[PDB]
Amino acid sequence: PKILNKILGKILRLAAAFK
């Protein structure tokens, strides 16, 4: 399923909101 990269990608997605 969603591996680390995906979860990481999820963070990046939110990180975009934070950044």
Q: How was this structure determined?
A: NMR
How far is the C-alpha of 4 from the C-alpha of 18, rounded, in Å? 20
Half-sphere exposure of 18 (CA within 13 A, CB side): 6
Residues 1-19: b if buried by 16+ CB within 10 A, e if exposed: eeeeeeeeeeeeeeeeeee
Q: How far is CA 12 from CA 1, 2, 3, 9, in A?
A: 18, 14, 14, 5
Dihedral (CA of 8, 12, 14, 19) sign: positive
* H-type alpha helices, 1-19: 4-18
How far is the C-alpha of 3 from the C-alpha of 15, rounded, in Å? 18
Backbone φ, ψ for residue 3 (5° rounding): -75, -175
